[PDB]
Amino acid sequence: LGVQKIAPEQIRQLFAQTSEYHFSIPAKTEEKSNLNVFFGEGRRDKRGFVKPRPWYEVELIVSKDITSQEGYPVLKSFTVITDDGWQFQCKTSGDYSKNFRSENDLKTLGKWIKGRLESHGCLQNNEKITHETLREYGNDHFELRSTDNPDVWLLSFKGK
DNA sequence: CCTAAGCGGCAATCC
DNA sequence: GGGATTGCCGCTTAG
Numbered sequence A: 001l002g003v004q005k006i007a008p009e010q011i012r013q014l015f016a017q018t019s020e021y022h023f024s025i026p027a028k029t030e031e032k033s034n035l036n037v038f039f040g041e042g043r044r045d046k047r048g049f050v051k052p053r054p055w056y057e058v059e060l061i062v063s064k065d066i067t068s069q070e071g072y073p074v075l076k077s078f079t080v081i082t083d084d085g086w087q088f089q090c091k092t093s094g095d096y097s098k099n100f101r102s103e104n105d106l107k108t109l110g111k112w113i114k115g116r117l118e119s120h121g122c123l124q125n126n127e128k129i130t131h132e133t134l135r136e137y138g139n140d141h142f143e144l145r146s147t148d149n150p151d152v153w154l155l156s157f158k159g160k
Numbered sequence B: 001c002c003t004a005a006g007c008g009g010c011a012a013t014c015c
Numbered sequence C: 001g002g003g004a005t006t007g008c009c010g011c012t013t014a015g
Helices: A010-018 A034-039 A108-120 A132-136
Strands: A020-025 A077-082 A087-094 A099-102 A141-147 A152-157
Touching: A034 A108, A087 A108, A099 A108
Parallel strands: A077 A152
Antiparallel strands: A020 A141, A077 A087, A087 A099, A141 A152
């Protein structure tokens, strides 16, 4: 839905700048959370009827060691511009403001992260993201960088 | 009245 | 019983 494509030249100009704030967010291989929300309990109502997590539903659970650092966007909404040229809204939420998610749709961040893993042939549908998934991809961290716009961050996840 | 999931927080764990 | 951290689950609210 609310996704925008940014031209490779506007991306070059944007990513050329230096960042006041920057964080290296681990791509965790936890099995019922983070990248692998798909393999956790679904959403169950009071009558016990459950609803499977979508494949692209993800979160980046960010440790306090990082969210407590100077400049981190705690409980803010903000624009994210990816290194491969996509723009969408993300939101930090939950206790310690640990949950890094795309806003209004959890799948958007998932389509970005997983769709990237899929394209490079490191991940196929309904598969767990493991150390070897990330090792084959060539990256196990997300770069969250600031721009001179307080509400726009750069998000990177380059592979091999 | 609903249903569905965005996102807030529960709870398992380790001190 | 308490706090501190964060996987993980499902409450609550907007549609």
